Design an enzyme around this catalytic site. Sequence first.
Site, PDB file in Angstrom:
ATOM      1  CE  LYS A 139      31.961  -3.946  21.174  1.00 38.33           C
ATOM      2  NZ  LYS A 139      32.270  -4.405  22.558  1.00 38.33           N
ATOM      3  CE  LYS A 141      20.095  -1.199  18.346  1.00 34.32           C
ATOM      4  NZ  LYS A 141      20.627  -0.596  17.070  1.00 34.32           N
ATOM      5  CD  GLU A 150      19.037  -9.577  25.477  1.00 31.95           C
ATOM      6  OE1 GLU A 150      18.024  -9.287  26.150  1.00 31.95           O
ATOM      7  OE2 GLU A 150      19.632 -10.671  25.564  1.00 31.95           O
ATOM      8  NE  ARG A 172      22.405 -11.310  25.354  1.00 27.77           N
ATOM      9  CZ  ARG A 172      22.489 -12.095  26.424  1.00 27.77           C
ATOM     10  NH1 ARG A 172      23.605 -12.778  26.665  1.00 27.77           N
ATOM     11  NH2 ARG A 172      21.456 -12.204  27.253  1.00 27.77           N
ATOM     12  CG  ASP A 226      28.311  -2.051  11.517  1.00 21.16           C
ATOM     13  OD1 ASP A 226      29.296  -2.694  11.093  1.00 21.16           O
ATOM     14  OD2 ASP A 226      27.547  -2.498  12.412  1.00 21.16           O
TER      15      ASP A 226
HETATM   16  C1  LIG Z   1      13.354  -8.714  11.671  1.00 17.73           C
HETATM   17  O1  LIG Z   1      13.195  -7.433  11.126  1.00 17.73           O
HETATM   18  C2  LIG Z   1      14.002  -6.447  11.705  1.00 17.73           C
HETATM   19  C3  LIG Z   1      15.187  -6.796  12.328  1.00 17.73           C
HETATM   20  C4  LIG Z   1      15.973  -5.810  12.882  1.00 17.73           C
HETATM   21  C5  LIG Z   1      15.572  -4.488  12.805  1.00 17.73           C
HETATM   22  C6  LIG Z   1      16.410  -3.383  13.406  1.00 17.73           C
HETATM   23  C7  LIG Z   1      17.580  -3.461  14.018  1.00 17.73           C
HETATM   24  S1  LIG Z   1      18.381  -4.689  14.793  1.00 17.73           S
HETATM   25  C8  LIG Z   1      19.802  -3.964  15.313  1.00 17.73           C
HETATM   26  N1  LIG Z   1      20.796  -4.401  15.941  1.00 17.73           N
HETATM   27  C9  LIG Z   1      20.984  -5.762  16.369  1.00 17.73           C
HETATM   28  C10 LIG Z   1      20.825  -6.106  17.696  1.00 17.73           C
HETATM   29  C11 LIG Z   1      21.036  -7.418  18.073  1.00 17.73           C
HETATM   30  C12 LIG Z   1      21.413  -8.372  17.145  1.00 17.73           C
HETATM   31  C13 LIG Z   1      21.588  -8.016  15.814  1.00 17.73           C
HETATM   32  C14 LIG Z   1      21.375  -6.709  15.430  1.00 17.73           C
HETATM   33  C15 LIG Z   1      21.581  -6.337  13.955  1.00 17.73           C
HETATM   34  N2  LIG Z   1      19.798  -2.480  14.927  1.00 17.73           N
HETATM   35  C16 LIG Z   1      18.412  -2.134  14.123  1.00 17.73           C
HETATM   36  O2  LIG Z   1      18.125  -1.061  13.676  1.00 17.73           O
HETATM   37  C17 LIG Z   1      14.394  -4.122  12.177  1.00 17.73           C
HETATM   38  C18 LIG Z   1      13.613  -5.117  11.623  1.00 17.73           C
HETATM   39  O3  LIG Z   1      12.414  -4.808  10.995  1.00 17.73           O
END
Ligand SMILES: COc1ccc(/C=C2\S/C(=N\c3ccccc3C)NC2=O)cc1O
Length: 328
Positions: free
Chosen positions: A47, A66, A50, A45, A154
């Site tokens: 900011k 996401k 999720e 999760r 970021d």
């Molecule tokens: C387990 O493999 C993966 C894991 C994540 C992603 C993409 C994310 S995750 C994201 N944001 C969040 C949301 C909640 C918590 C943490 C983060 C980093 N933004 C993206 O593009 C793609 C994957 O294949």
Amino acid sequence: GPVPSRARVYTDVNTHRPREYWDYESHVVEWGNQDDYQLVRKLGRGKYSEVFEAINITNNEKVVVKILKPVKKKKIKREIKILENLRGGPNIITLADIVKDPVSRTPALVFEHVNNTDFKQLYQTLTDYDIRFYMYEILKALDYCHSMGIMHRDVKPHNVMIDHEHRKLRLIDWGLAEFYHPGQEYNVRVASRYFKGPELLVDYQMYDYSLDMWSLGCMLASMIFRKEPFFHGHDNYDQLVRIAKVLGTEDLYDYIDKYNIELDPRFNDILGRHSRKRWERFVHSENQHLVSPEALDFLDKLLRYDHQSRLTAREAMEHPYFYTVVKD
Ligand SMILES: COc1ccc(/C=C2\S/C(=N\c3ccccc3C)NC2=O)cc1O
């Protein structure tokens, strides 16, 4: 007032793209079928969202979903447009679909799945060769997105997914990314504290792709010196003090003087006077196997106060540090 600044590379990329490329507010989202995806388990999760592991039941393949928290639609469209613009580029996470989640009443982004090892555990196992290899792979992603007119804003270990078994890397979380336009002023409340560039910490808004190169340098320093995070500030003011204790205060004043910037008067009591340090002071018997003269020179050329003086991603790929990396 402050002296303006331009990117030294890819300056005019969006100027000569069609308007549809960068005008994300006008983007029309192509929605897929929400019933194609079954959520399996929650992964994190944030900011603003999720994230879940899921299965695409039209091919029984793992995907990552996401689900965005409520945020202004311009921000959602910005991330979607950037992901679609960058799709297929080297080591860029692939956006596979966009669906409307019926519970959250928000968009859900569907990504390719990376079988990743969390960086806290991965970084204690990587060799000197592993670090050079994965840095080169990150640079491919950054040169690509910069060449496509986009800054990530970021870069940090949490946003680099690595499947170490397959030597596969993806740069993720484009939710803070923006299009670079010459002369545009940007929000400085981007990046994670430990990876924030000096330009953000002195409130200089006319920054560019070179912000990502400072963040990358912070990652490199933490990996080759085995200190994570490297610059470990307790707030945004202390973050700049931590940087100044290494790069020195005289070159900080040269930086803000060049752009006719004033430091926050809050720094009068906390900044002190500090010489610039030599990087060899951070080498010891438990990290020396990750350090070489090439690594220190490369690091030194990323971590510059002046954003205009940092290596570009392409220049970084030319650096002798990567001569030992096997090229395909
Ligand atoms: C387990 O493999 C993966 C894991 C994540 C992603 C993409 C994310 S995750 C994201 N944001 C969040 C949301 C909640 C918590 C943490 C983060 C980093 N933004 C993206 O593009 C793609 C994957 O294949």
